[model samples]
Target chain A: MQIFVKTLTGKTITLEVEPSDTIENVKAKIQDKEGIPPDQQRLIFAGKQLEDGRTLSDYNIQKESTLHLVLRL
Target chain B: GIQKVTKRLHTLEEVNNNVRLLSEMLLHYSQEDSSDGDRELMKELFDQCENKRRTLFKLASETEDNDNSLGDILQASDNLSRVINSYKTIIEG
Candidate 1:
């Protein structure tokens, strides 16, 4: 399935992943694309944090869903 | 007519001028102190201001091809102006 992630700088990145992918896996993808360190990255879905080890299915994320990534200082 | 194009281009020029002014102002504030911590903070703020300025310019350019919404354009201008004023306060204070 395809998902969209929007960076804090107003750029969007699209990724295709399996439902089995964990939030950490997605975070790695973000780090690869945006160069944001995973330690400082916060992936927010519907304004809530996506806990580590949680799968996309846990969050009810569907194909083409868009997630907002906020980088915290 | 040439006059109308000139007028439109003049407005664009003013936008460009303000963007340059903001950039210089940001640089001034960013370099005012030599502390490593403060310098990093200032650099981040400078990057934010530059991004907003680029967004404003992109919107202005898009106005030619798309029926750009005036409200969005004005908001971008307001954001740029606010950042500039805020940075000025930091510099003068």
Candidate 2:
């Protein structure tokens, strides 16, 4: 499974993530790829802020579904 | 009482000053195009401070010292403490 993260800069990137992966786990991958730390990133899916401790499937996230990203800034 | 009002205002001023520092930090981070963690946390903290300050301001404005309801002051104090604690949570987490 994969997630498509769309950032404020109008850039889109894909992160290979498992459905069972916690948002925190995917955040670590994004930390490496997006150069934004997990602590400083906000992930929005389905009109709610995704919790770091919750699984991707818990949020009903679908493959290739675009998650909006915001810097804590 | 005017005495209580003065004391509360003084306390609010101090919090405002602390928030002022955060606002400066956010500005500096923006000017420099800061990356990574520090700047992002600063930005969040700044927003939190500003929101708290506004809440205090409204509470103060609505209070009339002569007919002042101590209830509002207590509420404001509770709200401010929680706001400060929220920022603390983020920093300490």
Candidate 3:
């Protein structure tokens, strides 16, 4: 699915994500794409806890979902 | 860079100092005969500042850990939602 991605610094980057992907897995992908560290990346879906180990399928996230990536400050 | 760390640390220190001041003020006001509404508002503010302080501490530690990732600072602020919800509960109680 195409997801709308944004860096913690408000830079936008869109990418395809799968429902089976975990938060950590997404973080890894984002790090590879954006050169950000996994530990430094935080994923938020509409201001909710996207806790570690949680999968997109768990949250029932659909394709083309917009997820915000706010860097840890 | 040491200068970058120093700058970030300085910002975090300012936030920490403000939180401390607000916390002290909360304590002082809570001791007074304020109305329930006022007391609740003060408590909520105190909790919010406390949570921000916690985030500031976390950011400071991560900055000190030599990670140097900008994401750490952003994540610290993003985590504020949890603290805000807690404050809501305190106000509703």
Candidate 4:
């Protein structure tokens, strides 16, 4: 399935994701796209911060849903 | 107190979503040439972003200083403000 990872600047990145993919795995993909390290990327869905150990299915994230991305120093 | 904190966090998230949506629309217009109709839509979108920014400020103020999550909540609010400022720049150009 595919989903969108959106930056604070409203830039959208289309990502192919699997429900079984953990948040950490998703962050790795984001790093590949934006060159930001996985440690510096934070993903939020439905107002909840996603944990690295949790899978997309753990949060009930849907295909094509947008996850807000925040960058940390 | 925890319930109220949860409510505030959720409210902040809701506003964030709205800001995010408005910013996306504004980005679309910024990238394209605006016809007369597009220009009109751009004006409305700018106004909506301003309105949402005010709400974001209010939400930022309401995040209690003593809460364990205060730092995270305020950081998110701050980031959102910067995003709005970027839109302001885009709209002005």
* Top candidate when judged by TM-score against the true structure: 4
Candidate 4 on B27-56: residue-level lDDT in tens? 555445544434444354446556656765
TM-score per candidate, chains pooled: 0.46, 0.44, 0.45, 0.47
Chain A TM-score (model 4): 0.94
Candidate number of the best DockQ = 4
lDDT of 1 by residue, A10-60 (tens): 467888787778988898888888787888776655534576768888978
Error of 1 at B8 (Å): 16
What's the DockQ for every one of the candidates?
Answer: 0.01, 0.02, 0.02, 0.03
- Model 1 off-target regions past 4 Å? B1-93
lDDT of each: 0.62, 0.63, 0.57, 0.67
Clashing pairs in 2: none
lDDT digits (tens) for residues B19-43 of candidate 1: 4444543544433443443334444
True contacts kept of each: 0.00, 0.00, 0.00, 0.00
RMSD of 2: 14.1
In model 2, where do residues sit more than 4 Å from their true spots? B1-93
Estimate the lDDT of model 1.
0.62
Model 2 Cα lDDT, one tens digit per residue, A8-41: 3445778898878898878888888978888888
lDDT for A2 (candidate 1): 90
Model 2 chain B weakest 10-residue run by lDDT: B23-32
> Which pairs of residues collide in candidate 4?
none
Best by lDDT: 4
Judged by whole-model lDDT over C-alpha atoms, candidate 4 comes out at: 0.67
Residue B36 error, candidate 1, Å: 31
The CA lDDT at B76 in model 4 is 60
